[PDB]
Structure 1
Amino acid sequence: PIGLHVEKFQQTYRKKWRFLTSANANVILAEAASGERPARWALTTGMASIPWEYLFFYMSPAEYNRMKNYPGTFAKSASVRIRTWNTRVAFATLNQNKFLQVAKGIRSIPFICSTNRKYTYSDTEPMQPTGFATLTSYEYRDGLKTAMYGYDNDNKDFAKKPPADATGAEIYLQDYLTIYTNDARATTGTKILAGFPPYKNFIEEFDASACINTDVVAMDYDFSYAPLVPQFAPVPNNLITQNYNGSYPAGTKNEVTAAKTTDSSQATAPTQVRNAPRKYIQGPHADTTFFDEEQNYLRVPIEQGGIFEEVNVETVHDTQMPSINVGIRAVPKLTTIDETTQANSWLDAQGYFEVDCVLTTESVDPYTYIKGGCYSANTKSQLQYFASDGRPIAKVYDNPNVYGRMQMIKTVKP
């Protein structure tokens, strides 16, 4: 018994990037209440986020459009190496102290509320954030992808964005780590006055001068369930049997996934919901808007463990890739004339980061039948969670964690 003819492919995507980060000052910014978002204090950092959790980081649009032709593709591994170089410091002073901040896994820390934000800067102090730019994390990643890979040859603004993948040039990063604390100025009743969390107790800080041209980040990740392309559709057994809608015992094991909803306001207890609305991503009644629209390139992270469910007996668990933020500590420029205990002026400093990223993906072609083409075993069918409005649900890393977890969100039509 030779069994199935399954043709197995492994592909590797390597990219290499030059990143410049501003040495932003640590200032407190007020963010007003907006709808369900409350009023809060924002503490900015100079640690720019490295979007190693997204497919555009490793794959050019050509490689992605070719990968489309390989159903059953799963990202098996990702690896990122970050190597710092000389740090630029504005000149009139000569002696300089340069420090390199590296934050790994801040996004998953439960008690630290933090997101990556783009700041607006004062004209007089380009290192001092004075507000928040309207740019979102999706738009940050989209502009980053445009800087990496250029426009199309027919674009009216093609010349504005030379491709970093072609030139090897540097890209400035704008999303920097930002901690939040509650703003109790207008809070009525019980006020929480804990201030900020000591986030510097959870980051690594190095001597930039000694770390010039030295590896400072080396992070590897194995994906649990990262479907880049949906599997081949099986031959539907409803065309061959009246048994298609049969039931079989599951025993004491859970072989249908569940979703956990929490409430940090403690108004309601946490809830576990089984058999949430979901639908197949290949087959007769397939819904492939997630892969067609399209989402897994830069809008949604590579790792989607928990979101995608197979009819197989295989166990499913929640997943989360560690976050990476790297930056240069702000260089103070305060003196005795500008009488103050904390720096209110800083020197323009830039960190130089060389990023080498490798992504391994792997795909199958199963020949379960003689004619037509590839058909999978129906145990390979995959389902994705959906909302009530036919809108797919996916993991997001942009929002702050919920009890240390990355949440599901309804995707957005591009």
Structure 2
Amino acid sequence: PIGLHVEKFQQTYRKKWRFLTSANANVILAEAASGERPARWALTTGMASIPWEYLFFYMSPAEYNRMKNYPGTFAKSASVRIRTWNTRVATLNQNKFLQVAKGIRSIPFICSTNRKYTYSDTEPMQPTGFATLTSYEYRDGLKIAMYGYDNDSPDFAKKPPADATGAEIYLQDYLTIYTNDARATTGTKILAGFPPYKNFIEEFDASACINTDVVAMDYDFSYAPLVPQFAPVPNNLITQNYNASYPAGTKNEVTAAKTTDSSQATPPTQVRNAPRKYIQGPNADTTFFDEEQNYLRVPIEQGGIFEEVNVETVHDTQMPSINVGIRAVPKLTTIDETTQANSWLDAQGYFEVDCVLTTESVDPYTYIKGGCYSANTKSQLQYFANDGRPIAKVYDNPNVYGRMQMIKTVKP
């Protein structure tokens, strides 16, 4: 027989961006202890982060607002291609080198985070501190640079849309590696210095790399729900059971959350039946999608966070990170008497990024009247905190045992 009527819609979003990186110096910065954050030393790089894990990177505000009209939308794949151009920089015989880090965020023993620095006036290439800009605010400023303001905004003329002009956007969130600050540490100290992150990045002479793919990555999403599924017809209005238990075997079909403690004060634990809420139907909590976290604030893939009422397998996921930059060009001289450079040339990287996102949605017609209804096996759950604030996976924190953590969303 013909069976169920389902309409499948595939959509593709392509963007082309041009980014300028700073080629900062590798300078150790002190960051003071603040609450749970310990005192630590921070070593800066010039390798700017490419926010390819977020939805604004691929699709504009118009495309996002239209996609919000297609329930059941899943991001199926993403792809990013990064090429490099001539590196803008007294001398004429400079040496310039291009640095690429792929998946350095996943490395368990390299504590790293993308940060924005403040720079010296005398040495514009030397970071002297940290700007208060968070990673979300960096992505938001980048989105406003990409797509402009609304026509009624009094600040409209300040940021012409790069999606219209094709102009370059200064890419100002660079990799930073952390180590202990044992100056005030009591008891036994860990004095291991820095990890040799040089051994985990690729470095080329970009003279021969011009207009060639320095980065080429493809990613298939395990579970990236962009719009919640159509709500099923609730069986509690039709059946007496609607609350029945059925025998699970030795298979797990309710996901669990694993909590680890690198302080080793507590052993790792795994807790099943975490607090979570439906994202469609009678008692839906669509706060995540109404606040539009997935567009700019949260990565596309949320594999371990969302759950369906089904026997499918769920597993933890993380997208690899991309950092592209240029090694700082030293200005070192004998009269400086230093073994390491204290002055640098104003180099600048020019990167061209082609990004493609493929998504797919379904319209199921389960009942004769009303509208689209899915099977109740397609009902989706999402982790929630005990304060009602949804939980999402984040990529802008240091990895915990090589894994990306899940935390409460912020926006009210």
Could you tell me the TM-score, scaled by structure 2's length? 1.00
Instruction: Name the CA distance, whole Å, in 1 between partners of 2:85 and 2:196.
Output: 28
Identical aligned residues as a percent: 98
The structure 1 segments of at least 4 consecutive aligned residues displaced by more than 3 Å after TM superposition are: none
3-state SS of paired residue (1:297):
helix
- The aligned residue for residue 6 of structure 2 is 6
Q: CA deviation at 1:63?
A: 0.2
Task: Tell me how far 1:214 sits from its aligned partner.
Answer: 1.6
The offset of 1:161, in angstroms, is: 0.2
1:346 aligns to what? 344
- SS class of match (1:291): helix
CA contact (8 A) 1:73 1:228 kept: yes
Deviation at 1:294?
A: 1.7
User: What is the RMSD of the two structures over their aligned residues, measured on CA atoms?
Assistant: 0.5
Q: Is the 8 A contact 1:19 1:352 kept in 2?
A: yes
Show CA shifts across 1:101-129 (max 9, x none).
Answer: 00000000000000000000000000000
Distance in 1 of aligned mates of 2:236 and 2:372: 18
Aligned to 1:190: 188
Q: Deviations over 1:120-142 (max 9, x none)?
A: 00000000000000000000000
1:73 positional shift: 0.2
Task: Write out per-residue CA displacement over residues 187-243 of structure 1, whole angstroms, 9 at most, x where no aligned residue.
Answer: 000100000000010000010111122211000000000000000000000000111
Measure the CA separation in 2 of the matches of 1:213 and 1:310: 44
Q: How many angstroms apart in 1 are the aligned matches of 2:201 and 2:186?
A: 34
Distance between the aligned counterparts of 1:81 and 1:376, measured in 2? Answer: 37
Matches of 1:221 and 1:45, distance apart in 2: 26
In structure 1, the residue corresponding to 2:193 is in which secondary structure? coil
**Aligned-partner Cα distance in 1 for 2:276–2:188:** 41
SS at match of 2:178: strand
Q: How far apart in 2 are the matches of 1:68 and 1:291?
A: 9
Which SS does the other structure have where 2:302 is aligned? coil
Map of 1:28 onto structure 2: 28
Q: Do the aligned partners of 1:331 and 1:346 also contact (CA within 8 Å) in 2? A: yes
Give the gaps of 5 or more residues in structure 1: none
Is 1:386 the counterpart of 2:390? The answer is no
Are 1:87 and 1:212, in contact at CA under 8 Å, matched by a contact in 2?
Answer: no
In structure 2, distance between residues paired with 1:156 and 1:190: 57
Supply the distance in 1 between the matched residues of 2:147 and 2:253 (Cα, whole angstroms): 42
Aligned counterparts of 2:198 and 2:221: Cα–Cα separation in 1: 29
SS at match of 1:384: strand
Check the 8 A contact 1:102/1:327 in 2, yes or no: yes
Give the alignment's TM-score, normalised by structure 1: 0.99
Partner-residue secondary structure (3-state), 2:334: coil
Distance 1:364 1:190 in 2: 59
The 2-side partners of 1:218 and 1:368 are apart by 41
CA apart distance, 1:83: 0.3
For residues 374-411 of structure 1, the C-alpha deviation after alignment (integer angstroms, 9 at most, x for no partner) is 00000000000000100000000000000000000000
Alpha carbons 1:105, 1:322 under 8 Å: kept: yes
Cα distance in 2 for residues equivalent to 1:294 and 1:54: 12
In the TM superposition, residue 347 of structure 1 has moved relative to its aligned partner by 0.1
Q: Give the distance between the partners of 1:397 and 1:67, measured in 2 at CA.
A: 24
Aligned residues: 412
Deviations 1:38-78 (A, max 9, x none): 00000000000000000000000000000000000000000
Q: Which SS does the other structure have where 2:295 is aligned? A: coil
